[PDB]
Ligand binder design. Structure first.
Ligand code: SF4
Ligand code: SF4
Ligand code: SF4
Ligand code: SF4
Ligand code: FES
Ligand SMILES: [Ca+2]
Ligand SMILES: [Ca+2]
Ligand code: NA
Ligand SMILES: [Zn+2]
Lengths: 191, 62, 410, 108, 103, 666, 216, 59
């Protein structure tokens, strides 16, 4: 499957030269780095091409990398039940950059893009129903960004005065403890 | 003494196979939650002498 | 694919249908609703009890698991997996262990591999018993859940005897399984397997050929192969339509190659087919459990954890040997480091393909942990699936999709 | 406690470090005799997930999860267990706990 | 608020240098912590201090703080220069040593 | 400067040929395990953990800590020499040595304070096997009696001799040694006596295992719980770089951190162990004196009472030893704005105002290392800056000559006793120096004790004259962390303390606890600890200590350094700049800033070099002119090393150390 | 783009389920094109469930916030409404379909001119755009039955609440750090009494900050 | 505080593990009795070992 995945990666790199930035095969998985402007065209090719028939969209997610000029990665996981193979597609996205929506290709991409928008704040263009899907109504912020606190900023309580569940600033009886165990020794890479 | 047998953890009853007890063990108590013997933290307002807490010693004027 | 403006066989157009739809019959179906699993707020637009729009509002059980995982070590994150598809917790633990084992390049012992298959199939029965019999309760059958959940009670006792917890085992570990099974537990699992087909017959006698049951499921929620590919269907959601796809065979993991079992598939892809597929899968899982117990008895005594640099030593060694004490101290505080890389490890979970997308960065904590729940993709299709049906069919459709919101919301 | 009546806990804090829920809080000093012992040992039973990692991490079998499960309370603060409450549980449940440790020792 | 950009120093208790390669952007505690009366736990209303970002270069940290309108202070690191011994191990036995080497 | 190419594993790198292989490996970013080697100690070569493979050499692995690059036989044709840190031989060598290190090591990790930050644990995890083959009884060792700072568990000792080499080479004492032979050889102090050194706390860091641990810190925390803050020490004027470890609201310990130009990687025992005084004798409320007794008051009430006492009066402002530069700048702005007088030379030091080359000098601390002649004038560096004294000893070990003017004291190195009185100083300045001597690097160091008398200005004049004659750098060794910063913002009055207190009716005492304000004026004390200053006060405004706020401190060489907040002041204590800002409003003289950042903008406008953190400004040589000296002998500034400031005097541990020192001297 | 489907979806899924029952508000939001009232660069994201940035420190509020804000003002056919900070005029266009007339106050001449052009292009004639400082309102046409402030405030100046009729309603989003509270005010006996309505967040409007100086 | 347990020994080196069968005590450690004081205490269980000087056999 390692030779098979390398052969498949050449087929994609050849047929979609301008979409593909590079390919990698690590830990038995093929990853394709693609340009933002060509990701929809490439995923469409992967879905429909005979050699690579990736007709199941497994999921879409994002990864935050604040140290990088384009801080976000958007990652597409696709499965082919007919060819019995998997592929990962990665695109680098800058903050406030728009990502084209995949709902034209996969109707089931709709909720995954809402989740990326909710938890990372990445907007998708061409999305019919783009609204928060997992956080509370009117939530401020995007919790899966590395610079959002784990406990957030606000918490709810039932107020006897307002007879409502209201938000208040977070007050922790015991503050979150973040132990740092990491050793100053990397170890060796023996040949 | 009987909890293990009643919950099928042990095959034999304490009548036939009594449990070994250390001299520092204490007698069993039921759940005391709705009573005055219920456990409460030292700083609880139930205690009526909640333990005062501090982590520095203050200077006292002469 | 839009039926809000009624279309009649006589071509008539009502005066009111001409006006723009401002005053529609919208109803909150859940969260506090017996068919809504407690945390589903589905907004339904009804027209004479015909479902014209279904708008699932989820996140009522979103707990920020993926954020909480980023500040914990790999071992501290293992119990989070238990609480996603919490009906069958060890099956979800398996994806986390497989991902770590792949990135670290670790080989788990043979006995641990057999135990993982054994308790994964227990989880499949735990899930299918819950799914099938509460699905029956969704179409009004009161009794099936009572019979099924007695058998679940017995399986939860097998959970507790392996790990000390009836539900949230935290039993599968990176490097194998935490503890070995007592010999008398293997005898009891074998004894339970001999009785279980009788309960499956009794449930089949009560339901399968009941005319009411057929009229509540046959030709309801029909899924074609093309629909399956629109919505990321996996598991019984594709097998009910006749696609003999099962990750244990197509992309084998653990030691499933050497077990004998078959893949049930449906021909019509409706709620009735998926019910029959789940009943058949329960029989197949029972057979796997029987083979695994036989293999475990025939195995030579061995360890259940890989030990080495990945798992703590045994307690007796920890209290005697200096190396073991250090490895115990370090692995329970810092934990192993996982080399930089990204993997997606998937299993055939009872509800479909469950996967973990793990981004490691060489430290003792995950950089990113994305959890792929099969129910997230299945629930998203309820609007398409329920359009055109009546309100009474909605609980049956929620049942057939096999939704647990611990994994939908995470 | 040990059979000699001394506390087993030596304030190593491995249980506090492994706890997935951060349910354990420990403070320690040298005792009057110079012994390494805790002065605070709290378990927030409303944070705890009952995973048993603490008893796995403990190198001296000081903290264990016992056989008792019928201790529902009428107030929430009754579930903030301090050191004396936990030690009292150990002194009342020791006989059953010790037997269970012997039964599972071959698998640990 | 004010953030600290600095390169964490080596832990004096250890000789390893692996935790000294990265820059970090930190949100230092903003207000005093309190003692919970009930159990004596450390209470806080400052969740922003939970955030600790990690960078490879000072420029990356300084850029992030700028793009996000954060007032920052950059504390420069104090690298330990190599103590190059001209005679190496042999200086232990130099004829002009003040006192004998102790091994 | 003839760099040599060497290939380490697969990295080709160019290095000084005098580097050892271990130093070259670190320059290439290649990790090499070690126990006995330390960058600042003599090479020992006894742990054998650093063994590497020299390609082409004899099959023996080589100790990379002891092998210089120039010792490597050059490669064929002049190709760079190769060493492997990844070969199977190295893997087997490291596994073998780690096994030998652990066979007799006790199973102590749960009860051992090193656990979690232990080089033995960490390198055993990374470089050893995961199992044991040893089936014999282990060695058991008796413990030592090293005093109240170092607890010993000698069964944990791995015989690295770091402690022996540090105490002998750096601390300059000869109490520790390794007696016996073989596996029964013991690290020990002579006659099991307590170590006598104010540098001894450093062996706790240096010991790689939990054999030598801190008694005050024992059992109180694990390394993973601690929040770490990189800050600057104020226990002396050296401004050592430190790490403050806090858990919740409290500091748990203080550790050195590296600064090649100031303290290297050492701190004195006062710097290290005063955290127990940080939470004692604290002023946490305002106080007001009513009918002869100080009674609690609220912040608005005390500020009003202070404003009433000050309005319309003659005000004197005193700035104490532990005050940051911004607070001194704020006080100068406030008190002088009311037509008052502010003095910082509360110890009587006759430091000239505006002449930075005369109250700071021209020498960096790092210049001492290379100096070949060092002249000490009325300074005991062992009590004023023990880490700086250790740097003088290092120069003396390389051959430097040391002369001293003052009382003969044990400095841990030999020196020429030129004399004890001001006649001795006179001889040095008027001496003639060969052109050969004038060309060698040298330094003149002057203590505060020399310049604290009526002729203090003249004493400096001769010191600068001597420095100019010898073509040598000058360093004025200060005792107070806040002095040079206070001088930089010009917090001085002509005539010094007595010229600021003459005729004053209100004295604003900002942290001056080493001099008494005689009865009379109305005294407002701002400070963090209750001591001399608070006992005299009629109003007490509680301020933050040096770990509880950000502050700018200029060290003895004139380097501005930023202390960082690690925790918060107890009770109602406030940041020192804030209190003065709040008081200004009640006095109708509101300061032109609402935040510390606003205060710092105005400060670097008056004193621009305070904006350049961690840089030593170059001072223009401006020698003093008046040379009339006195007759008395020189007195050293510091009488008791451990009890120099109110935070140290609130420390029970410093009292014990001071008591022990007196019991030794008697 | 089929903006009509996006508009209908926005009302169905972001307005109706959020306790917006007033059918006049639902009718208005189903008809006023949101994309016509955003900068050209934001046209494709006009119907996203978030605040749209109009200018530095200024947003077009999220559909949930505006829907609930208008639903609780309870506007009548005879009402005169002051819309403070109208941006490009989306909110004024929606309220114009319910109230008698709207006075839209904008402080950026660029946005005030665009509001007039876009309001006219949609044939909205009971909306007058008045250019000036937001915190001043428009006292020339006072009193108003209702005041809507379209951005976060820390305090509502008395000058602004004096332009409110007795029995008039004012709805403002208050910001307390990371917490945003929409409050509904009622003018009684000359005093505006504020009450909690719901929680939502937006950036602070310029000119509505509170006086914050040195505190010991 | 009095010791929880005293044992008298005739050797200057003792091992303690909590006296519990097959991994139920504490990690096994070896302790040295000083010739000056004649006793040592376990750091895990606080058991005190006291030398019997007259019969103390050097190894
Ligand atoms: S059982 Fe409870 S206290 Fe113990 S590790 Fe698990 S969560 Fe923490
Ligand atoms: S209970 Fe066990 S693991 Fe926890 S601190 Fe005590 S000895 Fe250590
Ligand atoms: S020195 Fe290190 S290895 Fe030895 S007992 Fe202490 S923590 Fe464990
Ligand atoms: S006591 Fe510590 S520093 Fe000294 S020789 Fe032993 S291990 Fe080395
Ligand atoms: S570090 Fe080289 S032998 Fe010890
Ligand atoms: Ca209709
Ligand atoms: Ca004792
Ligand atoms: Na140490
Ligand atoms: Zn013991």
């Amino acid at each position: 499957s390692d030779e098979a995945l390398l052969e498949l990666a050449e087929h994609i790199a050849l047929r979609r030269e301008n979409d593909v930035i590079s390919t990698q095969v690590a830990f038995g998985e093929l990853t394709v780095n693609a340009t933002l402007s060509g990701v929809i065209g490439l995923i469409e090719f992967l879905r429909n091409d005979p050699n690579c028939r990736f007709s199941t969209l497994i999921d879409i997610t994002a990864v935050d990398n604040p140290a990088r000029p384009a801080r976000f990665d958007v990652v597409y996981h696709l499965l082919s039940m007919y060819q019995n193979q998997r592929i990962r597609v990665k695109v680098q996205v800058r903050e406030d950059e728009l990502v084209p929506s995949l709902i034209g290709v996969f109707p089931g991409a709709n909720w995954y893009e809402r989740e990326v928008f909710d938890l990372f704040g990445i907007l998708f263009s061409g999305h019919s129903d783009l609204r928060r899907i997992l956080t509370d109504y009117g939530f401020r912020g995007h919790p899966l960004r590395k610079d959002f606190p784990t406990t957030g900023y606000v918490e709810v309580r039932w107020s006897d005065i307002e007879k409502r569940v209201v938000y208040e600033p977070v007050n922790l009886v015991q503050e979150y403890r973040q132990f740092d165990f990491l050793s100053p020794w990397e170890g060796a890479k023996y040949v | 003494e009987w909890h293990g047998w009643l919950h099928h953890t042990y095959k034999e009853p304490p009548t036939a196979a009594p449990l070994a007890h250390k001299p520092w063990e204490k007698p069993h108590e039921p759940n005391l939650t709705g009573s005055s013997g219920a456990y409460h933290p030292a700083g609880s307002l139930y205690r009526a002498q909640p333990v005062e807490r501090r982590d520095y010693d203050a200077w006292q004027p002469e | 694919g839009d039926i809000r403006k009624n279309s009649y066989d006589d071509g008539s157009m009502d005066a009111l249908t001409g006006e723009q739809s401002i005053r529609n019959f919208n109803i909150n179906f859940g969260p506090q609703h017996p068919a809504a699993h407690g945390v589903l707020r589905m907004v339904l637009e009804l027209d004479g009890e015909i479902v014209e729009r279904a708008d699932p509002h989820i996140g009522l059980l979103h707990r920020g698991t993926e954020k909480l995982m980023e500040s914990r070590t790999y071992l501290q994150n293992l119990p989070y997996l238990d609480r996603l598809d919490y009906v069958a917790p060890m099956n979800q633990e398996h994806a986390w262990c497989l991902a770590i084992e792949r990135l670290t390049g670790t080989v788990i012992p043979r006995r641990a591999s057999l135990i993982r298959v054994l308790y994964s199939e227990i989880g499949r029965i735990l899930n299918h018993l819950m799914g099938v019999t509460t699905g029956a309760m969704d179409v009004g059958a009161l009794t099936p859940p009572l019979w099924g959940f007695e058998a679940r009670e017995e399986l939860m006792i097998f959970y507790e005897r392996a790990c000390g917890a009836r539900l949230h085992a935290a039993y599968f570990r990176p490097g194998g399984v935490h503890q070995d099974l007592p010999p008398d537990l293997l005898d009891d699992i074998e004894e339970w397997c001999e009785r279980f087909p009788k309960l499956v017959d009794d449930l089949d006698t009560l339901l399968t050929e009941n005319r009411i049951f057929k009229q509540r499921l046959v030709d309801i929620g029909i899924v074609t192969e093309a629909d399956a590919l629109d919505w990321g269907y996996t598991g019984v959601m594709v097998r009910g339509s006749g696609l003999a796809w099962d990750l244990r065979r197509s992309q084998p993991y653990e030691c499933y190659d050497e077990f004998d079992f078959q893949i049930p598939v449906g021909r019509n892809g409706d709620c009735y087919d998926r019910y029959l597929c789940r009943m058949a899968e329960m029989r197949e899982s029972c057979k796997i459990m029987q083979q695994a117990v036989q293999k475990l008895r025939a195995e030579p005594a061995g360890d259940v954890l890989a030990r080495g640099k990945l798992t703590p030593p045994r307690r007796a060694e920890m209290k005697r040997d200096m190396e073991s004490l250090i490895h115990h101290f370090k692995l329970y505080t810092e934990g192993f480091k996982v080399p930089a890389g990204e993997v997606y490890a998937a299993v055939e979970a009872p509800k479909g393909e469950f996967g973990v997308y793990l981004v490691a960065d060489g430290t003792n904590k995950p950089w990113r942990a994305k959890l792929r729940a099969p129910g997230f993709a299945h629930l998203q299709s309820i609007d398409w699936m329920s359009r055109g049906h009546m309100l009474a069919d909605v609980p049956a459709i929620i049942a057939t999709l096999d939704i647990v919101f611990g994994e939908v919301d995470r | 406690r040990y059979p000699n009546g001394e506390e087993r806990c030596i304030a190593c804090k491995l249980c506090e470090a492994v706890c997935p829920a951060q349910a354990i809080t420990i403070d320690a000093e040298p005792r009057e005799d110079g012994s390494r012992r805790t002065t605070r040992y709290d378990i927030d039973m409303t944070k705890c997930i009952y995973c048993g990692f603490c008893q796995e991490a403990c190198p001296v079998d000081a903290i264990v999860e016992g056989p008792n499960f019928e201790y529902a309370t009428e107030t929430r603060e009754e579930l903030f267990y301090d050191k004396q409450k936990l030690l009292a549980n150990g002194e009342r449940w020791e006989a059953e706990i010790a037997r269970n440790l012997q039964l599972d020792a071959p698998y640990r | 608020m004010r953030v600290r950009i600095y390169k964490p120093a080596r832990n004096a208790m250890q000789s390893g240098t692996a935790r000294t390669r990265n820059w970090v952007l930190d949100f230092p505690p903003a207000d005093p912590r309190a003692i919970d009366p009930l159990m004596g736990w450390t209470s806080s209303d400052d969740t922003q201090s939970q955030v600790r970002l990690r960078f490879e270069t000072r420029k990356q940290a300084e850029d992030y703080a700028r793009e996000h309108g954060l007032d920052y202070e950059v504390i420069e690191p104090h690298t330990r220069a190599a103590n190059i011994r001209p005679r190496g191990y042999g200086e232990n036995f130099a004829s002009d040593r003040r006192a004998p080497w102790t091994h | 400067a003839d760099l040599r190419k060497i290939k380490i594993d697969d990295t080709i790198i160019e290095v000084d040929p005098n580097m050892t292989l271990i130093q070259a490996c670190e320059m290439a970013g290649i990790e090499v395990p070690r126990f006995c080697y330390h960058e600042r100690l003599s090479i020992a070569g006894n742990c054998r953990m650093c063994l590497v493979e020299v390609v082409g050499g004899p099959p023996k692995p080589a100790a990379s800590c002891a092998m210089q690059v120039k010792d490597l036989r050059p490669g064929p044709e002049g190709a760079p020499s190769e060493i492997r840190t990844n070969s199977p031989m190295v893997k087997k060598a490291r596994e073998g040595v780690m096994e030998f290190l652990l066979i007799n090591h006790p199973l102590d990790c749960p009860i051992c304070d090193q656990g979690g930050e232990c080089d033995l644990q960490d390198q055993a995890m990374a470089y050893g096997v995961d199992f044991s083959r040893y089936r014999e009884p282990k060695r058991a060792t008796e413990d030592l009696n090293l005093g109240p700072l170092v607890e010993t568990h000698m069964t944990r000792c791995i015989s690295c001799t770091r402690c022996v080499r540090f105490t002998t080479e750096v601390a300059g004492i000869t109490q520790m040694g390794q007696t016996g032979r073989g596996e029964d050889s013991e690290i020990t102090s002579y006659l099991n006596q307590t170590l006598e050194s104010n540098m001894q706390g450093n062996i706790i860091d240096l010991c790689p295992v939990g054999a030598l641990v801190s008694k005050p810190y024992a059992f109180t925390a694990r390394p993973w719980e601690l929040t770490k803050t990189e800050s600057i020490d104020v226990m002396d004027a050296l401004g050592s770089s430190i790490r403050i470890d806090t858990k919740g609201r409290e500091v748990m310990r203080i550790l050195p951190r590296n600064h090649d130009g100031v303290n290297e990687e050492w701190i004195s025992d006062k710097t290290r162990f005063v955290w127990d005084g940080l939470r004692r004798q604290r002023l946490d409320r305002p106080y007001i004196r009513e009918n002869g007794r100080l009674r609690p008051a609220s912040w608005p009430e005390a500020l009003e009472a202070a404003a009433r006492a000050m309005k319309g009066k003659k005000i004197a402002g005193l700035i104490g030893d532990l005050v940051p530069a911004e607070a001194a700048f704020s006080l100068k702005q406030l008190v002088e704005g009311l037509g008052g007088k502010v003095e910082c030379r509360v110890d009587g030091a006759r430091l000239p105002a505006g002449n930075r080359s005369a109250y700071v000098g021209t020498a960096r601390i790092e210049d001492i290392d290379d100096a070949e002649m060092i002249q000490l004038i009325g300074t005991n560096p062992r009590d004023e800056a023990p880490v700086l004294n250790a740097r003088i000893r290092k120069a003396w070990s390389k051959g430097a000559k040391v002369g001293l003017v003052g009382e003969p004291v044990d400095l841990t190195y030999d020196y020429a006793h030129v004399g004890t009185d001001r006649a001795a100083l006179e001889s040095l300045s008027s001496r003639e120096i060969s052109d050969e001597t004038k060309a060698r690097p040298s330094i003149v160091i002057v203590g505060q004790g020399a310049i604290r008398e009526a002729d203090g200005e003249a004493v400096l004049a001769h010191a600068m004259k001597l420095a100019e004659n010898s073509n040598s750098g000058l360093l004025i060794l200060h005792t107070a962390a806040g002095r040079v910063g206070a001088m930089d913002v010009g917090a001085v009055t002509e005539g010094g303390l007595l010229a600021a207190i003459d005729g004053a009716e209100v004295v604003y005492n900002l942290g001056a606890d080493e001099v008494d304000i005689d009865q009379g004026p109305f005294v407002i004390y701002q400070g963090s600890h209750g001591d001399r200053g608070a006992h005299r006060a009629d109003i007490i405004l509680p301020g933050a200590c040096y770990t509880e706020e950000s502050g700018l401190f200029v060290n003895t060489e004139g380097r501005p350094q930023l202390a960082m907040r690690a925790n918060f002041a107890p009770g109602e204590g406030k940041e020192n700049w804030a209190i003065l800002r709040a008081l200004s409003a009640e006095l109708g003289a509101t300061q032109p800033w609402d935040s510390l950042a606003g205060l710092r903008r105005k400060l670097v406008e008056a004193v621009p070099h305070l904006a350049q953190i961690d840089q030593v400004p170059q001072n223009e040589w401006q020698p003093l002119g008046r040379f009339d000296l006195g007759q008395a002998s020189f007195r050293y500034a510091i009488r008791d090393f451990y009890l120099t400031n109110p935070i140290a005097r609130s420390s029970p541990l410093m009292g014990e150390l001071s008591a022990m020192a007196a019991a030794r001297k008697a | 783009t089929d903006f009509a489907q996006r508009r209908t979806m926005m009302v169905d899924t972001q307005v109706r389920p959020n306790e917006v029952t007033s059918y006049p508000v639902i009718e208005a939001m189903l008809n006023v094109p949101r994309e016509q009232f955003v900068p050209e660069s934001r046209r494709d994201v006009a119907y996203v469930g978030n605040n749209i940035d109009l200018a530095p420190g200024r947003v077009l509020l999220e559909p949930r916030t505006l829907g609930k804000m208008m639903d609780i003002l309870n506007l009548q056919n005879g009402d005169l409404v002051l819309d403070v900070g109208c941006g490009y005029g989306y909110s004024a266009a929606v309220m114009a379909r319910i109230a008698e007339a709207v006075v839209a106050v904008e402080e950026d001449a660029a946005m005030a001119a665009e509001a007039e052009g876009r309001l006219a292009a949609q044939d909205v004639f009971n909306v007058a755009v008045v250019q000036g400082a937001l915190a001043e309102g428009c006292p020339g046409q006072a009193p108003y039955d209702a005041i809507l402030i379209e951005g976060a405030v820390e305090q509502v100046p008395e000058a602004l609440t004096e332009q409110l009729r007795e029995g008039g309603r004012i709805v403002a989003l208050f910001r307390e750090g990371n917490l945003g509270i929409v409050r509904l005010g009622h003018k009684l006996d000359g005093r505006v009494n504020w009450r909690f309505a719901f929680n939502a967040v937006a950036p602070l409007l310029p000119g509505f900050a509170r006086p914050r100086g040195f505190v010991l | 505080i009095p010791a929880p347990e005293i044992q008298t020994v005739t050797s200057w080196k003792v091992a303690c593990d909590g006296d519990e069968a097959r991994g139920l005590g504490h990690p096994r450690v070896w302790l040295a009795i000083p010739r000056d004081t004649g006793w040592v205490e376990c750091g895990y269980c606080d058991k005190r070992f006291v030398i019997d000087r007259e019969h103390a056999h050097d190894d």
